[PDB]
Structure 1
Amino acid sequence: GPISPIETVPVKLKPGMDGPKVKQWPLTEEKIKALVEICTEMEKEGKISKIGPENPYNTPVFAIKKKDSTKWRKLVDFRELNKRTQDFWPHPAGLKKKKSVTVLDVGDAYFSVPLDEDFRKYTAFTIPSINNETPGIRYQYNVLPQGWKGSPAIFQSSMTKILEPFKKQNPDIVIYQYMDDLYVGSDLEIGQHRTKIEELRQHLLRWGGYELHPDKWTVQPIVLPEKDSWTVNDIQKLVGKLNWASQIYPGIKVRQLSKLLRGTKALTEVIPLTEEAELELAENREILKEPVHGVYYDPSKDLIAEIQKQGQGQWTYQIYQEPFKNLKTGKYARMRGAHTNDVKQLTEAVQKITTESIVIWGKTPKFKLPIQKETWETWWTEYWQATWIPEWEFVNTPPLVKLWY
């Protein structure tokens, strides 16, 4: 296309790092057709340009449909490129406390600012063909691409000039920008909320949603099943669970409870609690209410979110930065695909945990998923409805104890 009139910023990759060289995964006929229609129009508008095989870099590309959406949207898997891109040069702590927060897709705006020439070769992607009838169609971005971490950083100043007449007339509203998404939160009534976000939407169209309520987000604490009549199995499960909790709270003790299990008894034999055993169980009950020592959010380190399948459509999750120091614990239930699809529920869990982590800390976690690599890589794109993609690892070790019920 034509040389963009806006002067370009000189971007570069991390020192010593080369561009991404990731292979394209197979795509359905529907998504290939959608990406052909999208990328042809994008090539006509000068946003992307065809390249040859001399470009040794590639980035996966596919298409998604958002919630209650019938239109395909192109999603490029810029995860490796974002990992290899240089970090640039704040997250509002007030956003998490607002009653209503709307997410708007402002990635299209990025299509108005050109991308650095010497950097364009790193944004190469290839649209595959069914049955390899024709060789894949390769493009590179001449403009700030959606899903790249550099696009919002470079478009930040322009966005500030776009939103100043809305930011000073309404200083109560909180605005945070992450990747292709804009989060606008407030404590206002929902009717005024729709009107104000429509106001900002037209304000965006003069230059040219997805609603959440974070103050209703619940935590899931460590609860001890405290019954009246105890079988041997219940007490040994409790001793294992508190022996596991003793790494989070070093004050936990399991001595007087373990003394009840003395001798070789049947697992279903009822055991009466002693006096110091009930006292110690109550003490350990309250030590779990004390905050964990040394816990705090470090933006310089990565967030890690582990997910556990609990059956009957409920899934627990933990967000921490180092073991046993959980910034947030929670549980989900009655999601899409409940009681008939584990991959869909796990995908929706990843999306919810990611959205919450962006609202709270302004960054996506790295996920430990309870699924084989092949299954997740086989079906996860069929249910993805977000414009960002977090990195994930695969856990194949069965948990001895659930620990979050």
Structure 2
Amino acid sequence: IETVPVKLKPGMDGPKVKQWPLTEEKIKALVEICTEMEKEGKISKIGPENPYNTPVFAIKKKDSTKWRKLVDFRELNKRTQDFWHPAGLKKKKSVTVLDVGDAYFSVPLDEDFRKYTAFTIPSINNETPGIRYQYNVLPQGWKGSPAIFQSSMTKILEPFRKQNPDIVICQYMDDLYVGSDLEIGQHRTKIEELRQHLLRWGELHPDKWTVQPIVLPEKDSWTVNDIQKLVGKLNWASQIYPGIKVRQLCKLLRGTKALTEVIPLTEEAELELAENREILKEPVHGVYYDPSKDLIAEIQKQGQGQWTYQIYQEPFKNLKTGKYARMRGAHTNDVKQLTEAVQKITTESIVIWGKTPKFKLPIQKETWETWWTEYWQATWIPEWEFVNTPPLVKLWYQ
């Protein structure tokens, strides 16, 4: 019946975040769910004397008929005291992720901090007052949960870390990441093995993530248009690679010619291009990760289902860049695709640096807030802001 006292960042107060509207279906599922946790002592209904509140909703993470309660403690976490990364995790063949949230129900929360964990189950058309609860145990999604549980966590983990001191197990929030250079059969079985050990209590490829190369258009014949677009893309890239030169190409344009006129390249321009392709055959030197600084994930809509992104801390010094596609069935849903993208990039940022990136989403606030919850499937929620993607920024990574 022990309880480590947890407090809010000095002078801070509990979160009073409003509950967005939920669908009948998500409400029903949540009433079932909460009634259960209430019976088991996990939570308890609260009174009006508690003025704090946190948003909650329901999801279905990868192939599930049954719903999962999800609480957005982002604001509570940003207000919770601080507490206290094996680069080996990133440098693995495969890395599997595990949801250990359940573990937390086992631990009771410092009763004085409970008031802050207050959340509400809305009623359709406001016909009824919302149902108010607060946690009695450690809530999943709370930055303090993993911490206060570390102690017990490590314990239950030693056995597997001693039996297999070749695998890396990193925990982030409610997730546990395990990476090993084994082969799949033995790897997935060794995993199933870990979930066996975990149960008697309560598929990514890292060597594949990098800074993708900027490729330049090659064609039989070049028009004035073609050269301009070419020079534009290059001129931008000069920002990342000062060596990049466009003198020769610009010359080919001297004069106010038609846009479609076919321009014959010179031996000089061809060298100029030859030379730039080479400057671009690799990422710009001297780009290192700074832990004392925020990670930033920028995404641009390429269209047709494609989305390029760059993770970075300082402008033009990409720590990583990429593209995301397909996801059959989402063939007509920009929000699904974007949400999947953000998750894919978060997990990735977690693996690599063990922290989430602040997102810059090319979407209108309203659009994203209406539906993103309908396609979320993680236990965590990164931070984000909305933007108006530059016409350029796109043709460049395109």
TM-score by length of 1: 0.93
Alignment CA distance shift 1:331-1:145 (3 Å): same
Residue number in structure 1 paired with 2:4? 9
Shift in Å at residue 253 of structure 1?
A: 2.3
Alignment CA distance shift 1:279-1:374 (3 Å): same
Alignment CA distance shift 1:16-1:276 (3 Å): farther
Given that 2:224 and 2:257 are in contact with CA atoms closer than 8 Å, whether structure 1 keeps it comes out as yes
Between 172-181 and 77-86, report the one with greater CA deviation. Answer: 77-86
Alignment CA distance shift 1:172-1:286 (3 Å): same
Query: Once the two structures are aligned, what percentage of the paired residues are identical?
Result: 99
Residue number in structure 1 paired with 2:91? 97
Given that 2:56 and 2:119 are in contact with CA atoms closer than 8 Å, whether structure 1 keeps it comes out as yes
Shift in Å at residue 214 of structure 1?
A: 2.6
Given that 1:98 and 1:185 are in contact with CA atoms closer than 8 Å, whether structure 2 keeps it comes out as yes
Q: Distance in 1 between matches of 2:45 and 2:328?
A: 39
Deviation string for 1:179-210 (max 9, x for gaps)?
11111111112221232222211211222xxx
Shift in Å at residue 284 of structure 1?
A: 2.1
Given that 2:173 and 2:380 are in contact with CA atoms closer than 8 Å, whether structure 1 keeps it comes out as yes
Which one of the candidate residues 382, 392, 396 is aligned to 1:400? 392
Between 57-66 and 251-260, report the one with greater CA deviation. Answer: 251-260
Given that 2:213 and 2:283 are in contact with CA atoms closer than 8 Å, whether structure 1 keeps it comes out as no
Deviation string for 1:91-122 (max 9, x for gaps)?
22112232222212100101111212222121
Given that 2:210 and 2:320 are in contact with CA atoms closer than 8 Å, whether structure 1 keeps it comes out as no
Between 223-232 and 57-66, report the one with greater CA deviation. Answer: 223-232
Deviation string for 1:293-319 (max 9, x for gaps)?
442112222211111111221111111
Deviation string for 1:26-77 (max 9, x for gaps)?
0011111111111111112121121122222111000110111222111101
Alignment CA distance shift 1:253-1:16 (3 Å): farther
Q: Distance in 2 between matches of 1:231 and 1:339?
A: 35
Unaligned runs of 5+ in 2: none
Q: Distance in 2 between matches of 1:221 and 1:11?
A: 47
SS of structure 1 residue aligned to 2:104: helix
Given that 1:95 and 1:185 are in contact with CA atoms closer than 8 Å, whether structure 2 keeps it comes out as yes
Shift in Å at residue 247 of structure 1?
A: 1.8
Q: Distance in 1 between matches of 2:19 and 2:318?
A: 36
Shift in Å at residue 125 of structure 1?
A: 0.7
Residue number in structure 1 paired with 2:338? 346
Alignment CA distance shift 1:312-1:291 (3 Å): closer
Q: Distance in 2 between matches of 1:336 and 1:83?
A: 36
Alignment CA distance shift 1:48-1:338 (3 Å): closer
The number of residues matched between the two structures is 396
Which one of the candidate residues 30, 51, 74 is aligned to 1:35? 30
Shift in Å at residue 397 of structure 1?
A: 4.3
SS of structure 1 residue aligned to 2:311: strand
Given that 2:211 and 2:318 are in contact with CA atoms closer than 8 Å, whether structure 1 keeps it comes out as no
Unaligned runs of 5+ in 1: 1-5
SS of structure 2 residue aligned to 1:340: coil
Deviation string for 1:276-303 (max 9, x for gaps)?
2222222222222354244211222221
TM-score by length of 2: 0.95
Given that 1:221 and 1:404 are in contact with CA atoms closer than 8 Å, whether structure 2 keeps it comes out as no
Residue number in structure 2 paired with 1:142? 136
Q: Distance in 2 between matches of 1:138 and 1:336?
A: 39
Deviation string for 1:158-183 (max 9, x for gaps)?
11100111110110111010111111
Alignment CA distance shift 1:237-1:26 (3 Å): same
Given that 1:336 and 1:348 are in contact with CA atoms closer than 8 Å, whether structure 2 keeps it comes out as no
Asked if 1:235 is matched to 2:227, the reply is: yes
